[PDB]
Design a protein around this ligand. Sequence first.
Ligand code: FES
Ligand code: FES
Ligand code: FES
Ligand code: FES
Ligand code: FES
Ligand code: FES
Ligand code: FE2
Ligand code: FE2
Ligand code: FE2
Lengths: 388, 388, 388, 112, 104, 104
Amino acid sequence: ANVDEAILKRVKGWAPYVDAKLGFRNHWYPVMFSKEINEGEPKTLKLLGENLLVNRIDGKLYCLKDRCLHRGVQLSVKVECKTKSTITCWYHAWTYRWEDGVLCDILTNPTSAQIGRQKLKTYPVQEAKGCVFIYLGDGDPPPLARDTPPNFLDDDMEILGKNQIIKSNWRLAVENGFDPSHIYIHKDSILVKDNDLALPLGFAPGGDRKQQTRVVDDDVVGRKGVYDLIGEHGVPVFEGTIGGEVVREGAYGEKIVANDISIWLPGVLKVNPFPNPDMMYFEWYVPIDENTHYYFQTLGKPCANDEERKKYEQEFESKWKPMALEGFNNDDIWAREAMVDFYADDKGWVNEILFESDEAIVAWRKLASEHNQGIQTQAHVSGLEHHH
Amino acid sequence: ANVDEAILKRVKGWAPYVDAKLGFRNHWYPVMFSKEINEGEPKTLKLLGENLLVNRIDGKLYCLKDRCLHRGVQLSVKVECKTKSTITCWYHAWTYRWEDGVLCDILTNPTSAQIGRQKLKTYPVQEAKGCVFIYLGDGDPPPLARDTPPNFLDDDMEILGKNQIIKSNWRLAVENGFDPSHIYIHKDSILVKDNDLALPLGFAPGGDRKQQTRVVDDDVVGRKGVYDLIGEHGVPVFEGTIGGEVVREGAYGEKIVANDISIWLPGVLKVNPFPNPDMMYFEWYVPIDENTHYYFQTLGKPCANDEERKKYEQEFESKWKPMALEGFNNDDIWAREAMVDFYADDKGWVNEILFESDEAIVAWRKLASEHNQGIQTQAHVSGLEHHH
Amino acid sequence: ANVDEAILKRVKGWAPYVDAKLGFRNHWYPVMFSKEINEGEPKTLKLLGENLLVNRIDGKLYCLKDRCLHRGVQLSVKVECKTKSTITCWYHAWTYRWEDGVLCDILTNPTSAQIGRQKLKTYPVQEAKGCVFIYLGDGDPPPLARDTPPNFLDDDMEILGKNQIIKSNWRLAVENGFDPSHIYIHKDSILVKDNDLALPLGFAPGGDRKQQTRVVDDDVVGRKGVYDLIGEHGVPVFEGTIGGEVVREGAYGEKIVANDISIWLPGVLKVNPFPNPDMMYFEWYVPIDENTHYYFQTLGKPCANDEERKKYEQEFESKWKPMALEGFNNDDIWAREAMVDFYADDKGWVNEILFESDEAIVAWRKLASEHNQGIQTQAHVSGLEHHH
Amino acid sequence: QIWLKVCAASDMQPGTIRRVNRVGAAPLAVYRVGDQFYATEDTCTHGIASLSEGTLDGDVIECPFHGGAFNVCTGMPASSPCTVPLGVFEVEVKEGEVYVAGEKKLEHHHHH
Amino acid sequence: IWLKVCAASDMQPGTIRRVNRVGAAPLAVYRVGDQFYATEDTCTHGIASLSEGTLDGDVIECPFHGGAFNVCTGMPASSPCTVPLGVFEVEVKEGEVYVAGEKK
Amino acid sequence: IWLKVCAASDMQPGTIRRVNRVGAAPLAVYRVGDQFYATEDTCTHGIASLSEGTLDGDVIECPFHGGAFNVCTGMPASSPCTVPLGVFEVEVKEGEVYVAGEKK
Ligand code: FES
Ligand code: FES
Ligand code: FES
Ligand code: FES
Ligand code: FES
Ligand code: FES
Ligand SMILES: [Fe+2]
Ligand SMILES: [Fe+2]
Ligand SMILES: [Fe+2]
């Protein structure tokens, strides 16, 4: 629906995925951190191409589509919250309740037949681990656990992170993250030297296709994802050669990280342990529109009390954030951007020449195509259409 | 045909209007003030998507299309008016007469067979009330009065105003202006308090549909418009409520204004009396291209002599212009800009959810669809195409 | 297929030319001067819409497409030339030989089956007269002489020049340069006065139209071009009149230049002699993309020894470059730019109103249509397509 | 006033729509599908259009404003942009006379 | 006055024939069925030779931009043409085609 | 040399069978009607297995990007494929399918 049919016909193995330029509807997505949204302080954001408004009332978060039903203007141009539980459009005063989006009043015409008979779109919002998740979907939402990597919601796992808007489609971000061989771009990262990491340049695969990954679709909470098992039969590459001569070597540090790497729908990667043997790393690539995504980075470390939580927070600010989240992942940002041109016309999905380690990416494309909960379309953004 | 036929098929009540994205051809339009065009100093402007040149010769205005017939360059890139009555293209010297657009000479080849056989498009231009009107149409023009609101051309009516380019399709400007309930956006205008105005927040309609307006199609001058009569049987809203509690009040000033509001083709609003009980307001929303328009504001006040005119000008400059044209209408500017996204893909014309007071807008849409003198198309801009 | 089929159907005299918005494939094109690329210092450029990389190894130039075969990123984002004869992609280390583009190694997986089984596109590169020419085509290239004007490659011809990027389609540049009547835009050039040049305002054609030009369908090296012979039987116009009155005069200098002017495929003009009796001028309008071109200017003068070359270099820098290349041709730059709008929607190719001197342009359009070696398409840029 | 007298069944041709105005209440629309009669609110739920000025295609009424549509028997939306169901009013014919209910049907005391 | 073009038999129906005149602009002769017509050869929209165009019935299409004219009336039939073509008198006497040295 | 792959009847018409070879690239055996053909199994444009593709007559369509090859000549039939497939002669004797050990 979003891509030239001729192209979709060519990618029979993962057409739904290639068509999902705007992301997958009916999934939970993190969009900001709890501390970023305060009581009675409405915040605007775009998710899956839709403009949304989020507000905190009596501590609870509510999400309303930022588009008046009347003449389609964004309520956020001039916010008017006249009562604690409502928001009034600045144009003709149509008033909606944050709780259910019902048009409960219209100041410009208290006798209007529209009152109580229209409802602005609302979306479920849930806060967990200091992160704000929005269920960009219809009907009753599934448990948040379904759309989060294993252990992210563990009781003692203290989560800290950073978020920003990156200029690339969300899928390019997902594939780069789960790309086994892209590790090559991190060979000079300050994290490697500064944290004594062991880091190969790549991998010489071993075994058959099935053995390169582990497709997960038996998880009890319903989460769907793929584990990268290239290192189970493959020989890590530490001496990079050209014409048989060594021109670059990997890192021979003592610390072993990234024992297990997994990508999960709707688009979140789990790297464990990372960036240190006692921490867990998770990052989301949330679709904002066809050309941009939120790069929601989270680092988790088990903490048993406030003392340890505070200690971790200090280490995060002074070391892990600048050394790993930025010092390591910054290269992933420009790497994603470098693929934009090739895939912008949707033709890269046909012309790409893949090699062995891409088996991991292919597995993800197939999993996403088969287990996504819906393809977001431009019609969802403007207004669903249906004739006769 | 400027819009998807599927959309036009859906809006059966005003399809011509929805299709008129570039404006209506064969109507007069104000583009600048007389004092802005000096003798022998050609000025450029774009009207209905067409680049034009206006010049004053012996005090009379002439309009030539700013596009050489030869290689289609704008003559204005390098103006060469070599004789009082002509303009010579800077490229290959094709020369045109301002009075009839005839190609009368070609300096690079005085023997060319094109001389005297080709003609550059000219448009009628008329000055009235210190305003420059151009008839963007074909054939002999109708009287200017047909495309102006009643009284604008009255002898004693002294006209003053301002003009600027605004980023929105002309139609969004027109509808906002004639919108009975948009008065809500003006509740905090400085003009309200500073001029002690009486201004409700909206209106509770009364009577039947036909009574909400007065469609004018029997005007002796040929004028075609609609009067907003929502206040005749409606109850003005001075206390806005949510859940029964008053959250906003209208303005209880002593001066009564804007009790006579009408919109006229090709797109000019008349508000009387405004901004003061002894003044009359007129504003045009002139199409420049599909995304922009001239916001031509004019305020009139009867003046019997130069003394009153001088005094009127002083108040205009020190009060009316800053307090009304800007202090009041500035909110109209961003309001119309706020509707751009919703209607940009033409989908807003189908998805908008109207309420009672929009009966006025509907009347206008139908009047415009039924009485416009032509739909401007991109072909008019590039060059008409046909095979008979 | 780069233009609306309906338009191509209308221009029966030169459809291939109108379709060649991206330029003609399979021709040599100058893109920079030899002194601009040094040993082991890869340089990027875009030619015919394709991103390219040029490197000098052991003094010889090599050209590789600047797009990795793997995920389509530009290798130039982060250049990694790890051995003298190769370049390694910064992403997954696919390594290519500059000599033949063969994928000879993959550092991230030395056991990949892709090694030695893929080839990155390469293009022939040749240096002549201090200029770097790239054959943007497929298969064995023809002699460079075929795509250069007569005498440019003469042994004693000393070439000096300037190059820059201009914002107009390459064809607008070609037509302006070969336009006999465009001489009018040069009437006030400092070169005309400072070098005492005789320069008419235009020409009154004489003889039949067949006599207006001289088409060369084949040279000893396969050159294809057209000479402007409007001055053979035409009358130079020195007095520009309007309504019979003289409003402008041409230049009555004693130096006669531009004895002959010819345009040659793929798009290079030769003016002889120019800007002085002892020199020859050649300028290319190289397609970068649909909206821009390289304006590659070159001035030649026969030099027998190092002494003459040195003197010539001094004269070029202190006089000819600023007075002619810039003082004369700068007006050609904005003239080309002025035609962009009219031809941008491809409609100018239908609506233009040509006159007598345009016989030269028409001859070029037909010659170019009949003898170009291929039409560059967007598919050549992204990847040729074809279904069984 | 439980049942509002509309017109004689013979006064309506198959495939036509009749508007029923009510004092102090919103107007209704009575549709004749074949030989059967149905009724809904006259005002389109998507705006302020009068459905009695629209086009009846079988048992589906199309709004003249934006092309939205409803099934006249159930009042459920049939075509976008309509999304809010119409209130439906029972209609009965007594002595060849068409009568429309004064109160709309409710999901009350009926089939589960 | 009347100039000799050719024999009516030399032209097949639906064909065009260019007539070059000494010291004057060229003309075009069209045979529509069994009737002959004449107009200026040069397209009024530019410098194209209509005799190098395509004749469809009584309408000639210019090879340059696809503009067209009715060969009988000389009136524009297809854009971008807008200026009427000059029409010249034609008469066939003794199986021979003649064209008036001047337009009507 | 020749490798005995299977009984002709082990393959239904229009199907593809992957033939794994220790220390060598896998092959694909195609049954087009009652005829058998063989090529390398790996698409020359990537890592796709042609034996998991779609056979249309004597043209195999790659499951990854829709590229295609003629299974008889090994030449590309559809983009993005450009590198010819390795072809292996096939022989059927006494209802048994044999494929050449070397490409040719
Ligand atoms: S656009 Fe919001 S109340 Fe009108
Ligand atoms: S473009 Fe104006 S005279 Fe040529
Ligand atoms: S994109 Fe160049 S090696 Fe992967
Ligand atoms: S008012 Fe009925 S479809 Fe919009
Ligand atoms: S020159 Fe004949 S249509 Fe333009
Ligand atoms: S891997 Fe076969 S067409 Fe791309
Ligand atoms: Fe990374
Ligand atoms: Fe207003
Ligand atoms: Fe020039």
